[PDB]
Short mmCIF file of C-alpha atoms in Angstrom, two decimals:
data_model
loop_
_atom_site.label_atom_id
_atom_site.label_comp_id
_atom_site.label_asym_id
_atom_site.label_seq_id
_atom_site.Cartn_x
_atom_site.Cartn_y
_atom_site.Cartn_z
CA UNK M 1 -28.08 54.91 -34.08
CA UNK M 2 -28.67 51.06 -34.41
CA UNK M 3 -30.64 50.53 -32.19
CA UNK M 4 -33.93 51.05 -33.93
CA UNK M 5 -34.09 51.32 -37.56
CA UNK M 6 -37.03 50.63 -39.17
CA UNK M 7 -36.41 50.51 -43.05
CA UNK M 8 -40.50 49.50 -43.91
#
């Protein structure tokens, strides 16, 4: 699922 994390 690495392909969009956004962690903000």
């Amino acid at each position: 699922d690495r392909v969009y994390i956004h962690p903000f």
